[PDB]
Design a protein around this ligand. Sequence first.
Ligand SMILES: Cc1cc2nc3c(=O)[nH]c(=O)nc-3n(C[C@H](O)[C@H](O)[C@H](O)COP(=O)(O)OP(=O)(O)OC[C@H]3O[C@@H](n4cnc5c(N)ncnc54)[C@H](O)[C@@H]3O)c2cc1C
Length: 473
Amino acid sequence: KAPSHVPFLLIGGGTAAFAAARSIRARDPGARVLIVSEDPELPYMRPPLSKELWFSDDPNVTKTLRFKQANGKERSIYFQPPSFYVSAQDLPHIENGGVAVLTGKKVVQLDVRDNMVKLNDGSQITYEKCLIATGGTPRSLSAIDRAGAEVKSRTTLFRKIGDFRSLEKISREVKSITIIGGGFLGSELACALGRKARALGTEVIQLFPEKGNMGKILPEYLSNWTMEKVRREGVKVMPNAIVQSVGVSSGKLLIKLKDGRKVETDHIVAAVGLEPNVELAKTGGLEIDSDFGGFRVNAELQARSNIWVAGDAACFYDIKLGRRRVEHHDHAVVSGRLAGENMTGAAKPYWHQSMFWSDLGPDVGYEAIGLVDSSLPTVGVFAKAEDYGKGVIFYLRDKVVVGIVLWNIFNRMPIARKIIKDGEQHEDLNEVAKLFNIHEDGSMSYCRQEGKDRIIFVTKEDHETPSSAELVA
Ligand SMILES: Cc1cc2nc3c(=O)[nH]c(=O)nc-3n(C[C@H](O)[C@H](O)[C@H](O)COP(=O)(O)OP(=O)(O)OC[C@H]3O[C@@H](n4cnc5c(N)ncnc54)[C@H](O)[C@@H]3O)c2cc1C
């Protein structure tokens, strides 16, 4: 039972909303914050759904939804125990405030002038400050939408706890699973499913239009190296694949590609991008970004007076890097926190950069920051003992580093932040790479230029010489 009025209203019960709620409470100890969540589940982190929860030793991981971190500490996907929240009944009156989550309730109408929303059940809530943190909904393929009810019921869109539970069940009861999508989600699920299938010898297929996995973010040579790694996890990878039609044939899904090839499979998992949830822009009169999608907000994540946007749904202005829309866990954290600080009057711009990460089997793990885009010219520095095992990849624009990928090297994000912040025009990025110490614990080094991409292979002796890189202090 929601209150008629609440000081802080958070639309969406995901990662960005929770971070904003924690941030608001940290700056305003008496704050009373209401999260309106369409989802019946309380706020939870999503990255475990495509990684750690598939690799748990526990047979009941599907019910406990607990996973063990790299440090060995078991954790819950939920951000907080249910007890840490207060009920919506008590939110207006409980001493020193708190955070309540109204679950199973969708905001369907937004009035920015009168600072009011309406829920799917007719309730109306007025607010003083409002955060839109609606995230996005998985996109679908046109060929899937034309295939009818049978195919659509055998096609999974992966995002929620429920999606993990249903796919985990299917993985134990079918013989072939086909993943459509080459990005981080399609690739992470392929490695997880591929690893589950090694025991029973079942089939796992991944197909996508690009030349290789992660083709939109990684340079072509590293995308190819990565594809071979995914293939080595027991996955049949089909690059250069454009789905022309899908149908059911003799109890089995049959995918037809423009190439002419054909795939027969028992279940499809479609990981082909995200659609920002901008339905409230119509009633609210809020602007949507035509180039990036999502609500257009400024550097402070503000859309209009008393209304902010954070997370996957927010197209914001980065003072250093330009207008962006970022769909990553740590961004939802950073943006939700920034929005909460600004809802309490901080008026701070996006400055501390968000990062992201992925793991594609045991041989591929990276962190990244900034404009990681494979269309940009790049300089990649890899350790020489072609093996792309450990290294750092710089993404350039106007001779300036605007994005960095840390390839199988960890705890280097501090250095990567400084490089992005300073914005220097470096004459030799091999000198900058020395700061990352990619050989921690005798032939000559060499380099190669493959179109827009430079590839430097550096030995320990050369890499651990003094660096002339310019750092701003
Ligand atoms: C399986 C998976 C694995 C991932 N792995 C990684 C990873 O390894 N690294 C990484 O950096 N990122 C990863 N991500 C991305 C990261 O999880 C997302 O960027 C993050 O969840 C975005 O949080 P959010 O708050 O912006 O949106 P969401 O988490 O989508 O939260 C939005 C919530 O609001 C609800 N909602 C929508 N509209 C309304 C409305 N009108 N009223 C009320 N509620 C509404 C939605 O139902 C949803 O519950 C992964 C995502 C998924 C799905």
